[PDB]
Structure formats: structure tokens, C-alpha cells
Design a protein around this nucleic acid. Structure first.
Lengths: 87, 87
DNA sequence: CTATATTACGCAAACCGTAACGATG
DNA sequence: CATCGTTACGGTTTGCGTAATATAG
């Protein structure tokens, strides 16, 4: 897993199609499709139903999505805590 | 912040010095020092006091160590779930 | 002279963006 | 056949490991 994959996958879930997701992240489309492939590979599971319209989430997608949000939340807060702890 | 920095940090924290963590992660020592620099910069905090005898954690680092462990654990379990939900 | 950390340098692998191709409602 | 997803390719960057540098016992 990479932090980058989590952010990208969250955006794709919220967008409903990979092009829109890319525009929201300020990258080109191909990094989106490739990073999703690496994620699905790394997890051993299909997160996304592809069509020419866009994407739907699988059961394993809806599961993962919830946890991706929480890993990002926790990473963010872990930083604020450490910085606070300095003082 | 990257997952690899979290693993490396935990290993450095447990080991008491960078050389022994390096061996336990099966990499040379310079990635360890460099990835601790990258991590410290990205958080904007100092986690470790370096001496010639090894390392000791700051307040900031004791905090971050616990959350490091939470994040990785949560990342592990989130895999397991997503695979389980694909049954 | 050992043990630790850091820095320098060279080469390989990863990663992005443009461009081409493919597939489908 | 218009629109989105994927794959190819070239060029930049990141990132390793070996070797060198610096400090301390």
C-alpha cells in the first residue's frame, strides 16, 4: 500500500469516473488507472467495476473505501499530535 | 509521509540504533538515515536524538511511534477486510 | 581500530506526462 | 463516434548500495 494509492482511490470513488478524479488531483489520467491497478494487485482484490461510462465499486471497494478514509484521517492527526507534543 | 518511513521508524525506535534496524529490514544503513530525514522534514518535527552510540526518541517521537503502530495495524486489517468482503 | 551516523556518487527502477490505441454505450 | 479507460514510450526523478567522511570511545 501507498498513501498515494489511498488518496487516488478515494477521489475515484467520490468522482465516479477516473478522468474527473485526475482533474481534482491535478494529474493526468494514466497515473490514475495505473495506481488503481497496483492497489488491486497489492490487496488481491477487485475494487472497481470498469465500464466506458466510468466506475462502480465492488463490495470489497466499499469496504476498502471506509478504511482508506480512516487511514488518511489517522495519518493527518498523528502529525498534529507529534507537532503539538514538541511543545 | 510514506508507509516505508513508518516501518523504518518503528524498527529504528525498537532497535535503539539505525544500523541494527537496517539489518532487520534487510537494507543498507543510508536509506535509514535518509528516510528519517525525509520523515522529520515532512512532519516538521524532530523525532530522534542521534549520538555515536545510537538513538533516543523525543517527545514528538514517542507520540509518533504509537500512531505509527496504529496506522500500520489499521492498514493491515483493512486489507484483510476487503478480501473477506469479496466473499 | 570499532561502532555509529551522515554525505557523495553512480546506476537502476519508478513514475509522470504526451501520445497512441481500444472498447463501449 | 465521443468518451472514457489503458498501454507505449521517453525523459526526469527517486532511491538503492558502495564507498567515502566525520565523530567518539
Amino acid at each position: 500500500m501507498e498513501f498515494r494509492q489511498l488518496k487516488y482511490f478515494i477521489a475515484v470513488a467520490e468522482a465516479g469516473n477516473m478522468a474527473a478524479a485526475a482533474k481534482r488531483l491535478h494529474v493526468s489520467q494514466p497515473p490514475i488507472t495505473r495506481q488503481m491497478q497496483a492497489l488491486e494487485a497489492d490487496l488481491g482484490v477487485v475494487l472497481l467495476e470498469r465500464s466506458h461510462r466510468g466506475i462502480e465499486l465492488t463490495a470489497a471497494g466499499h469496504a476498502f473505501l471506509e478504511d482508506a478514509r480512516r487511514i488518511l484521517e489517522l495519518a493527518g492527526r498523528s502529525g498534529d499530535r507529534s507537532r503539538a507534543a514538541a511543545r
